[PDB]
Amino acid sequence: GSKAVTRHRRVMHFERQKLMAVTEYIPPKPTINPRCLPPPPTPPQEETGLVRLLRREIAAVFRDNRMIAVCQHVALSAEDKLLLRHQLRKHKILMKIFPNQVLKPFLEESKYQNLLPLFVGHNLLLVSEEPKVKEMVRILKGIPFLPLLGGCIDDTILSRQGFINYSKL
Amino acid sequence: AAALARLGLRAVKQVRVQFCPFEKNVESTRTFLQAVSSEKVRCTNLNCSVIADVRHDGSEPCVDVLFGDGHRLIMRGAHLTAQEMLTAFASHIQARG
Amino acid sequence: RNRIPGRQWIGKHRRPRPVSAQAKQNMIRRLETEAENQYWLSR
Amino acid sequence: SGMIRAIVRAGQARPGPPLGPILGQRGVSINQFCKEFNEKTKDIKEGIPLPTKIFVKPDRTFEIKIGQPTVSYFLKAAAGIEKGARHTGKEVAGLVTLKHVYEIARVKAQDDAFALQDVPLSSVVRSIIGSARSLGIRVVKDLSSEELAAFQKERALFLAAQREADLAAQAEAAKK
Amino acid sequence: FREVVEILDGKTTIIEGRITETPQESPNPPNPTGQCPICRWNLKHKYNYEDVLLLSQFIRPHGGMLPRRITGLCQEEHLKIEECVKMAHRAGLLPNHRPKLPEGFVPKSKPRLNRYLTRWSPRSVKPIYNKGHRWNKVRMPVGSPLLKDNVSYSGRPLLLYH
Amino acid sequence: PEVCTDPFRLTTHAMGVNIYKEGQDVVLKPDSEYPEWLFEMNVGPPKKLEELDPETREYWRLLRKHNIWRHNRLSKNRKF
Amino acid sequence: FKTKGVLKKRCRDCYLVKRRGRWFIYCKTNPKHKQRQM
Amino acid sequence: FKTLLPVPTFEDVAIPEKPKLRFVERVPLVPKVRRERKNLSDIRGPSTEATEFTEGRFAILALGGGYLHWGHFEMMRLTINRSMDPKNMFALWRVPAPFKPITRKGMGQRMGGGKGAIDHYVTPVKAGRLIVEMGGRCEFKEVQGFLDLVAHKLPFPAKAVSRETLEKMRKDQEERERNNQNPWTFERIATANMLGIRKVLSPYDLTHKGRYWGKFYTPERV
Amino acid sequence: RVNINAALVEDIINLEEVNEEMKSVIEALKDNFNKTLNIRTSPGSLDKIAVVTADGKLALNQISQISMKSPQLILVNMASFPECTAAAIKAIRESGMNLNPEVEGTLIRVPIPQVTREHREMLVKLAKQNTNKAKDSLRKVRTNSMNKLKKSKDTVSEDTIRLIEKQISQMADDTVAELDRHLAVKTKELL
């Protein structure tokens, strides 16, 4: 004869075990699994202040400045990147980086949809007012493995050879 | 970048990647170019010369690596994965070098 | 090798004899019969 | 070999700690570095401590780049208080105006740190104001006429606070 | 399908990718509304280790598994099909999906024991020397538990441990 | 090693920024010379999350700083 | 090797692998981190 | 590229003085001179007191019954104090000090001769009762992380829950009870005395509904 | 180990008192025989020399500044408590061995001779004799407790008396085991 409460789990009577087994919980099982079922309609995303600011900045960049060069961003050292920034600001041309997730839709909606293959990997936008490509070509020639992908000079989409020809012009 | 940095790239002379950015199959080529142009690879050895040739009508991305075993590894990468190109390049340079 | 301490169905450590599907079905049938009985004993 | 950051007083150049072990581990002769420092800082005699970067090459040769002096010492000299507040935010260490912050920013714009960046002087002013916030020195927008009375009251307040702190430190030392 | 070809010509290595033609899906699925391939072809709760024609559709030529992000199956069916492929490989099905080793096929070993519905690996299960008594018995697992939801025409539950 | 100031010099100019040999202290130029960006900026109370405009980059910078603070607080139980 | 009932990584380079029907925390940088699930 | 999400901010919550757990005596200041019978009903059955949050946001919820003594109290106090930041967190108890005496035979080991001698005191705890309640300017993740050790070291099974977690688990239990498929349930059968099951059941089973057996509570028994 | 509650009797024997007596004896023996025989020529560090100050005993390193002039020369200095110089000199002169110092003012030169006398065997024998005397004292205490029990053996059951005797015997065995362990540790330290 054991007490009402024990430590050995107090193995129950056979009738009580049968009662527990019969009264065991049975979850509701739907006829068709809803995971792979035609999904519910789209819960549309809401535009945030960050993406709105990115769109506004990209629009301002594409409106104000003239030279918009697209280059392949190369993972270089911080000191070299800052030195390149200083050398570019000596000629007064700046650089920017924008995420592809917001850059691609704006580019395909705008008139610069021809630059989509240029923005697959790492990207860098060289922004210059009153373009002077000679100094940019000279400063890019100093680094061998940093290639100019293309860009637009006053609504004129050009490749690397086009940029070289324009600088020589 | 870490795999190339830890493999000892001191035994390479020239690496050139010739590609056309306006094509539809240059993602892997540009990924390989960025991986081989990482700062760790640059600081591993300064005697190597890295060249990025940009074309418009070439339409055939390729990578040529000349190293001091008198060896020229040419990879015409138009459909290969960037990771596959990286691992094949690493396996070849470690085996011969 | 494996011994059951004490008597088989008395001690603190009893036989782990489980419940069977036949017993479950029998209990369900008896429950249904008693539910019908208690329904007929309502009005 | 590497790079070492050293904050050294303008008029002080000693072949000892903490400058001793750092150069001794690198193997660079301390006397040559001291002579170079004296030659490069003998054109300055106000004793303003400055940070510098020593680039030790593998061949035991060193290069020196001297930047602008310390912002904390700049703020201390501008405010007239020898040491900053122990508990920032709870007590006031000093009082300056926008003129001192602008002057410090325009004289520090030539340092090796902010020379590479091309931001205007506004960012440097913001950095100086943040450093003053950390130091505990209060800045005011316009108190040119009241700065004399503000100084004459804050000097008395600060000397009273210093006396109280000295008494508390003496009591703590006696109790310990 | 993409194939990597390596050419050696005078200390020169050429690595090229070649694209070959691949078979496509049948035009008429019974349930076009289903997102999942098996769930739309109505093979859910139908396949087993015996059904080799379905398991062989997506497996590497060396017997390897295929990524779900490429296949498109739901997670449960992906796990079930992985289990079925492992069971078939251990049982001896898919004879042509083994790597070709010219050096290792000459030294023959002991004949392969016939097996099926094997759950664990043959080289990882130690023999049960005790085997347990009637009340406490170490039952021998047969088949994968992920296949307990298959249709049972007889209606008897599948004995996963015997 | 140097010496500080005390008289009207502190209010009338800065006597610790003069860096070279000659004691040529710079004078305090009139208020008209200093542009507006010196006076428009806040000094004492730092901007809070609710004070800033959500359509401004400073708000998102502060939000990133708060995210880093939250991550640091959560990662205080590192067993590695 | 240390036989344990519960395995946990003692550093970021420990990897868990199922071998011989058991679980093994293997570490290369620190060989003392070899753990075997019993 | 990933979006930026706002972080929770805690300013209304104020840290009270002495946020650390207070010390607890091994024995009450007034010892129980009279030896009392060890009633097991103080452990058996669900808890009716200290089952809800009063001022904190996180709690240690006990899923079973047992006895807590000075060793467990000291372990919990030391662990929480050493793993808790007093500047941003505060903690409080929810169970009283050990007051129920436990007697050991001692002199002579043969059965009989009278009651034994009082050895130590314990605090009876039922399933579903909070043990330690914490709050402050902290997130639940670290609190759960450093309270899981205390929950494991407690004799009865325990979890580090919050207000949201407790509400979610209660609603899940209610939903499971609501949508249970089989028409036969322990509560219904016990109430209806079907099959004469009252002969093998217990009078307290009518209230336990099969979810409680001795000191053990099964949350998935509906 | 049969241990009674030690609270159900409380009147015919005080196990708490017996344990207190045993622990006091153990501690006194330990401290005395250690500090007496821990000399081993060089008693660890000579910084622990008891010098009288304010009618109390403090170590040399406590009331002194002790340095090492030479590996065999201890240099004491009287700066912390420069008022017991004579007492410190006397204590150094007679500290276990013949450590005669030189009174060079505040400085004190202490040569370290000997460390070759091989008197450790005699010290071990003395420690064994002291341990035996302590065992005899413990046996006397146990006999006093047994005599108290016998005096109480009037109405109290001899079953309870036997239980208490077993408890006292267990405590005595534990204490003598502790004494033997201390003797072994001291023997190892000496040799």
Add this chain to the structure above:
RNA sequence: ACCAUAGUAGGCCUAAAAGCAGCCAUCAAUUGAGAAAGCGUUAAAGCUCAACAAAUUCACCAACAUAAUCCCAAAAACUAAU
């Protein structure tokens, strides 16, 4: 996978406290990085995290040895079972 630059050694005590025995502030530069969430130095230095740029399968807890003469019916995952 992907990388890590700036005021600055933020201010006090300590021989030293440079993100790291301790206390108080926790600002501000680059689109993009916390007076620093883990290792490490006597103090540094240095190695990792989260921040941008590159993608975006799923990813919260849950696994635990043993006795003595010799293991213990054999076996079976689908022909229709209230």
